[PDB]
Amino acid sequence: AHGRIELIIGPMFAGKTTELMRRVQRHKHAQRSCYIIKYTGDTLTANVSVSNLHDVGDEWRKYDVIAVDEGQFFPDVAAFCSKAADSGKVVIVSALDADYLQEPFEEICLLVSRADSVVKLSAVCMECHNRKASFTYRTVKSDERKLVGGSDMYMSVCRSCYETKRNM
Amino acid sequence: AHGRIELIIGPMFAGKTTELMRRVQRHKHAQRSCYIIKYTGDTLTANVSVSNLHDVGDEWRKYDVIAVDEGQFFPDVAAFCSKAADSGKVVIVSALDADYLQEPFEEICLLVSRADSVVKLSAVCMECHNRKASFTYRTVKSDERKLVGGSDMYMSVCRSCYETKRNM
Amino acid sequence: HGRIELIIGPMFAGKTTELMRRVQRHKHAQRSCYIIKYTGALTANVSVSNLHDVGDEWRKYDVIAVDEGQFFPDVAAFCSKAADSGKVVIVSALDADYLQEPFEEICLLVSRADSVVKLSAVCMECHNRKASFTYRTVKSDERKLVGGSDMYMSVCRSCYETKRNM
Amino acid sequence: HGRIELIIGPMFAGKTTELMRRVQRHKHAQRSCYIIKYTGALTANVSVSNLHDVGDEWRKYDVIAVDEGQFFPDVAAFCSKAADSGKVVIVSALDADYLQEPFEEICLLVSRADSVVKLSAVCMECHNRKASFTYRTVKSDERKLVGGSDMYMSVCRSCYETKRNM
Numbered sequence: 001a002h003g004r005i006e007l008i009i010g011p012m013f014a015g016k017t018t019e020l021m022r023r024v025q026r027h028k029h030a031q032r033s034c035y036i037i038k039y040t041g042d043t044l045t046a047n048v049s050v051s052n053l054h055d056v057g058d059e060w061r062k063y064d065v066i067a068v069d070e071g072q073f074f075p076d077v078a079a080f081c082s083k084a085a086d087s088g089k090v091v092i093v094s095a096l097d098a099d100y101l102q103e104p105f106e107e108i109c110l111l112v113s114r115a116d117s118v119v120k121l122s123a124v125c126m127e128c129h130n131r132k133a134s135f136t137y138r139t140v141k142s143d144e145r146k147l148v149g150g151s152d153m154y155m156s157v158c159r160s161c162y163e164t165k166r167n168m
Numbered sequence: 169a170h171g172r173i174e175l176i177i178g179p180m181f182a183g184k185t186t187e188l189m190r191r192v193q194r195h196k197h198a199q200r201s202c203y204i205i206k207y208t209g210d211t212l213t214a215n216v217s218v219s220n221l222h223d224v225g226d227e228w229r230k231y232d233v234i235a236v237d238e239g240q241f242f243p244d245v246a247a248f249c250s251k252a253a254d255s256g257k258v259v260i261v262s263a264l265d266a267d268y269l270q271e272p273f274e275e276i277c278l279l280v281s282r283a284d285s286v287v288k289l290s291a292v293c294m295e296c297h298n299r300k301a302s303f304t305y306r307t308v309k310s311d312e313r314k315l316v317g318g319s320d321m322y323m324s325v326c327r328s329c330y331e332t333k334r335n336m
Numbered sequence: 337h338g339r340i341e342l343i344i345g346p347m348f349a350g351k352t353t354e355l356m357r358r359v360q361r362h363k364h365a366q367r368s369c370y371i372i373k374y375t376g377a378l379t380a381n382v383s384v385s386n387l388h389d390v391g392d393e394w395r396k397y398d399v400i401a402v403d404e405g406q407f408f409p410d411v412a413a414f415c416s417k418a419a420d421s422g423k424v425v426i427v428s429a430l431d432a433d434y435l436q437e438p439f440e441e442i443c444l445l446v447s448r449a450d451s452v453v454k455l456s457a458v459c460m461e462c463h464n465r466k467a468s469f470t471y472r473t474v475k476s477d478e479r480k481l482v483g484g485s486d487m488y489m490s491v492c493r494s495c496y497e498t499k500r501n502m
Numbered sequence: 503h504g505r506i507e508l509i510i511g512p513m514f515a516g517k518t519t520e521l522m523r524r525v526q527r528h529k530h531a532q533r534s535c536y537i538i539k540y541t542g543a544l545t546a547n548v549s550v551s552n553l554h555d556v557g558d559e560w561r562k563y564d565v566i567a568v569d570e571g572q573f574f575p576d577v578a579a580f581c582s583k584a585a586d587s588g589k590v591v592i593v594s595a596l597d598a599d600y601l602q603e604p605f606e607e608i609c610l611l612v613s614r615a616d617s618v619v620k621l622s623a624v625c626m627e628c629h630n631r632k633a634s635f636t637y638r639t640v641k642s643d644e645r646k647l648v649g650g651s652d653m654y655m656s657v658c659r660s661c662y663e664t665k666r667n668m
């Protein structure tokens with residue numbers, strides 16, 4: 001078929017998963033089979049929760065469209081997406097491009113170069129409430145790169161709020 | 169404030185309401201007050217169902233962001249949106265731009281010219297399952313312009329399927 | 337086969353530059369492109385005051401581009417006819433006149449388009465905000481009045497209102 | 503105040519045309535624009551082989567545009583420094599090399615950008631699909647190899663694979 005990789009990035013609170021599911025739903029109206037892969041440690045179509053993509057086995061071959069949510073948590077995501085898109089799947093990934101220090105998730109970088117489409121969504125600055133936000137700020141003490149959570153541990157911020165808060 | 173009008177259009181099954189709510193949710197993370205107006209005959213923030221916008225009264229003035237779903241059903245929508253955006257509201261509208269005969273909803277036309285932003289979403293062709301779809305085809309006999317329903321009465325189609333089906 | 341793409345937005349948003357960006361892409365894949373402008377190897381250009389004056393020349397090309405669509409009175413139908421014959425049709429046009437009222441024909445195109453992008457400009461009054469409207473700066477009440485930055489400026493919503501007052 | 507906008511995509515997608523479209527918009531609002539290209543009144547232009555060679559000239563302008571960003575080795579840091587000083591920084595760059603591997607510096611920019619658009623081209627092999635990849639057409643294994651359609655073509659995913667076989 002005509003396989004492809006579509007990538008949705010942006011910081012937290014930007015609605016990336018909502019966009020992902022908007023796209024899935026469109027495909028479902030045309031009767032395409034859709035498989036949604038979520039990340040296992042993360043807290044109505046075919047889906048699975050795994051800690052890596054190799055654990056999906058070959059189950060993905062039964063579907064037209066593969067959606068991968070929270071892509072930054074999967075260590076082998078670029079290769080998975082390329083294998084699937086070479087087999088003719090439409091592969092849709094949502095992921096953080098940047099961690100709380102504004103450093104890239106390397107695997108998502110790889111996907112940018114392999115993607116047919118890349119959209120970067122914004123959020124609204126949760127600090128000043130006046131500007132578009134492109135960064136995620138962690139609000140709890142921790143230095144683990146991976147730290148699963150929501151608005152209890154993070155907020156999205158504009159460029160100048162991210163600086164200000166970093167100083168204080 | 170800085171008021172604005174954002175317009176989301178496209179045919180049925182394109183996820184316009186999903187996009188609308190994605191945007192609302194972004195504003196809600198920055199603690200903006202959001203009011204969602206739906207159409208009365210149509211079948212977790214502040215909301216109301218009305219048959220026209222004049223029935224909302226001045227209740228809309230209590231919010232930062234006003235979202236209007238199914239805009240093509242409201243006869244006074246352009247004027248409402250302009251009044252609200254002149255008062256400093258962010259106004260977000262989802263609507264069909266075109267009816268099942270591919271003729272414009274005139275009021276949505278007005279909004280295009282008054283909008284700061286206009287996005288037209290596509291669906292996937294529900295007839296051939298191979299192309300982007302920009303049109304809505306009605307699958308039931310009726311000549312009422314307004315005819316409320318879902319996939320039981322409509323389907324979205326690409327340009328050439330719309331023609332083909334029209335011929336048969 | 338065919339498609340209609342529409343590019344709208346106020347003056348000074350670069351709609352024609354976007355239209356040509358797209359044409360160029362198609363030229364790199366050896367598609368033939370026919371560009372129609374308004375007036376009162378792979379490419380081909382023409383100035384006309386309406387689309388009937390092009391005749392059937394357009395059928396020789398893969399891609400048809402129409403600039404300043406809001407000055408052509410039969411643009412909707414022309415684009416539909418061409419896209420039904422399998423052409424990629426790309427149109428740049430103002431959606432709104434200086435009174436923020438729609439060009440009716442460009443409305444019809446919105447409903448018939450596969451793609452619609454509305455570009456913005458930068459507010460020429462405050463220099464601080466995205467602009468979506470075109471303010472006329474010279475007294476007149478002719479709808480059509482050809483000109484440039486001497487006669488028009490692109491403005492944000494609130495500068496449009498302000499200027500309208502004073 | 504400041505911002506970084508990034509425009510990516512393969513060759514023949516019109517990234518530089520989009521970058522200039524944006525610059526032009528800012529010029530209509532009387533913003534000063536400084537355009538930096540690569541080499542081995544309101545405007546100002548410069549060719550350089552790295553961004554250190556610009557010195558502090560860039561501070562005199564509202565908008566800084568950087569073309570062919572993937573040839574500059576210190577682009578990420580440069581753009582961050584400029585956006586922290588309140589500049590609007592606009593960068594066009596290849597995200598991927600002819601082997602579909604990323605330019606590492608353009609990666610860093612993706613994470614630091616307020617806006618990222620990836621443009622497509624039209625497949626120069628099949629002439630039927632959107633193209634997101636750049637295929638090199640001449641044998642070589644130098645990463646950097648300056649050239650045009652003689653040496654490169656933009657292709658869709660499946661034409662990239664096909665050609666890679668034969």
Ligand SMILES: C[C@@H]1CN([C@H]2C[C@H](O)[C@@H](COP(=O)(O)O)O2)C(=O)NC1=O
Pocket residue numbers: 011012013016017070095096098099100101136145146147148149150
């Ligand atoms: C910014 C982040 C986020 N995260 C986590 C927090 C959330 O569980 C998840 C992102 O949620 P998202 O799906 O993109 O809405 O990633 C990290 O582990 N490290 C970081 O640096």
Ligand SMILES: C[C@@H]1CN([C@H]2C[C@H](O)[C@@H](COP(=O)(O)O)O2)C(=O)NC1=O
Pocket residue numbers: 179180181184185238263264266267268269304313314315316317318
């Ligand atoms: C195309 C349509 C649709 N409709 C209705 C069917 C649906 O109730 C509604 C559109 O649903 P939507 O919200 O855009 O997902 O509009 C008409 O009344 N007339 C038409 O010509």
Ligand SMILES: Cc1cn([C@H]2C[C@H](O)[C@@H](CO)O2)c(=O)[nH]c1=O
Pocket residue numbers: 347404430432433434435470479480481482483484488
């Ligand atoms: C906004 C507007 C522009 N124009 C013109 C100015 C330019 O000649 C052209 C826009 O490129 O259209 C009008 O004729 N009427 C209008 O209402």
Ligand SMILES: Cc1cn([C@H]2C[C@H](O)[C@@H](CO)O2)c(=O)[nH]c1=O
Pocket residue numbers: 513570596598599600601636645646647648649650654
């Ligand atoms: C894809 C690719 C392009 N280029 C060049 C070709 C052009 O000179 C320039 C793109 O405008 O970069 C490389 O040097 N290496 C690459 O891998």
Ligand SMILES: [Zn+2]
Pocket residue numbers: 125126127128129130131157158159160161162
């Ligand atoms: Zn902020």
Ligand SMILES: [Zn+2]
Pocket residue numbers: 293294295296297298299325326327328329330
């Ligand atoms: Zn179809």
Ligand SMILES: [Zn+2]
Pocket residue numbers: 459460461462463464465491492493494495496
């Ligand atoms: Zn202004």
Ligand SMILES: [Zn+2]
Pocket residue numbers: 625626627628629630631657658659660661662
């Ligand atoms: Zn191809």
